[PDB]
Curated annotation (Swiss-Prot):
Assembly description: Part of the U5 snRNP complex. Component of the U4/U6-U5 tri-snRNP complex composed of the U4, U6 and U5 snRNAs and at least PRPF3, PRPF4, PRPF6, PRPF8, PRPF31, SNRNP200, TXNL4A, SNRNP40, DDX23, CD2BP2, PPIH, SNU13, EFTUD2, SART1 and USP39. Component of the U5.U4atac/U6atac snRNP complexes in U12-dependent spliceosomes. Within the minor spliceosome, which acts on U12-type introns, interacts with PPIL2 and RBM48. Core component of U2-type precatalytic, catalytic and postcatalytic spliceosomal complexes. Found in a mRNA splicing-dependent exon junction complex (EJC) with SRRM1.
Tissue-wise expression: Widely expressed.
Gene name for this UniProt entry: PRPF8
Coiled coil spans: none
Included stretch of the parent chain: 613 to 668 of 2335
Protein role: Plays a role in pre-mRNA splicing as core component of precatalytic, catalytic and postcatalytic spliceosomal complexes, both of the predominant U2-type spliceosome and the minor U12-type spliceosome. Functions as a scaffold that mediates the ordered assembly of spliceosomal proteins and snRNAs. Required for the assembly of the U4/U6-U5 tri-snRNP complex, a building block of the spliceosome. Functions as a scaffold that positions spliceosomal U2, U5 and U6 snRNAs at splice sites on pre-mRNA substrates, so that splicing can occur. Interacts with both the 5' and the 3' splice site.
Protein name: Pre-mRNA-processing-splicing factor 8
Organism of this sequence: Homo sapiens (Human)
Organism ancestry: Eukaryota, Metazoa, Chordata, Craniata, Vertebrata
Length: 56
RNA sequence: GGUUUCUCUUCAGAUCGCAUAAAUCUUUCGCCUUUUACUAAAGAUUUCCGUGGAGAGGAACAACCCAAUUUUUUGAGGCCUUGCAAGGCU
């Protein structure tokens, strides 16, 4: 923002340089995909196989 | 003999990747009723999004000029004495 809004360009809602913000989430998603595949596999296993009686 | 393009196997040393996530455990910290979810540094171990080398199979596109000094175009041949060799010669 401070680099975009310089000179004649004033403060206001028009900056559209979206690569940086987009990039950060993509890296978040790289980490959270394994986690959710494991967690959601447990949710589905508990839904279809049933609750498992002996436990851990 | 080539190039491009898919699948599989194997080995990864290289900033394996001029980029960068998550989880588990152990130490120390911050939160302060308990547990999720957490705060932030160190170390260890995994997962995940990508990469490189090698090999095998399939498919597609192209093709079976120096003879005149310093070297290589000659100072080249002939005589005498001693035990071919040495020397004196022309
Ligand atoms: O200049 P703008 O494009 O209008 O941006 C504004 C403004 O930015 P600046 O004043 O820094 O130029 C706000 O800043 P404050 O007025 O609060 O100081 C900022 O707030 P943040 O600095 O917290 O981002 C606000 O963001 P938001 O609308 O989320 O409050 C943001 O507007 P946008 O970022 O939404 O364009």
């Amino acid at each position: 923002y401070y680099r975009f809004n310089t000179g004649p360009v004033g403060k206001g809602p028009g900056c559209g340089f979206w690569a940086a913000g987009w990039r950060v989430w993509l890296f978040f998603m790289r980490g959270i995909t394994p986690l959710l595949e494991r967690w959601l596999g447990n949710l589905l296993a508990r839904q279809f196989e049933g609750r498992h009686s002996k436990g851990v």
